[PDB]
């Protein structure tokens, strides 16, 4: 193995506009949000990370910030209240937004860079973007990886045209990490290495 074991404990949380798009039905939600982790799981696999579903929080009644247009806005917001209330539920490594909501600038994810376990940054807000759960499980991986330190796949550092950091996502997306987003991990995990990530659940 390439990589040290570590672990990330993920909390995902399931706004009201979600809720709603799935019939209000929570046992329909809890499955496509598992089916989204084992998916991620995979393709953490050869980062020797292990992911796990330490929460699933689903906004049945009413959003809890203001999910709006702005992603970045959004994102902030999340973290504010991840950090203010969702960690105080039960603690995680970081936490994935889900919406429904058509963000601005034909947007369907965004993420704080190499912020990971970070209490307000360790954040993503994804957009349930396709019918195809890997469609979304993929974003919400490129997500986590820009919060592990990636930037985008860049064709004077690797060859890789459809791997998870691609700058743009496509129908042929593939479930790889290119040579670029290992190299970034790597030196993550050599500048900044967190602790929260070194803890088995």
Request: net charge positive.
């Amino acid at each position: 193995q390439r990589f040290p074991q570590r672990y990330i404990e993920l909390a995902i949380v399931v706004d009201h506009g979600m809720y709603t798009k799935y019939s209000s039905n929570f046992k329909k939600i809890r499955k496509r949000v598992h089916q989204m982790v084992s998916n991620i799981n995979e393709m953490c696999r050869p980062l020797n990370i292990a992911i796990t579903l330490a929460l699933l929080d689903v906004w049945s009644e009413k959003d809890f910030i203001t999910v709006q247009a702005d992603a970045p806005t959004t994102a902030g917001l999340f973290g504010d209240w991840r950090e203010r209330v969702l960690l105080k539920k039960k603690n995680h490594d970081h936490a994935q937004l889900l919406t429904d909501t058509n963000f601005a600038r034909n947007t369907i994810g965004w993420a704080y860079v190499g912020r990971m376990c970070d209490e307000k940054y360790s954040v993503a807000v994804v957009k349930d973007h396709s019918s195809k759960v890997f469609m979304v499980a993929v974003t919400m991986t490129h997500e986590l990886g820009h919060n592990l330190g990636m930037e985008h796949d860049d064709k004077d550092k690797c060859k890789c045209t459809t791997c998870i950091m691609s700058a743009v996502i496509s129908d042929k997306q593939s479930k790889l990490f290119s040579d670029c987003s290992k190299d970034y991990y790597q030196t993550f995990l050599t500048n900044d290495n967190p602790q929260c990530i070194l803890n088995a659940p």
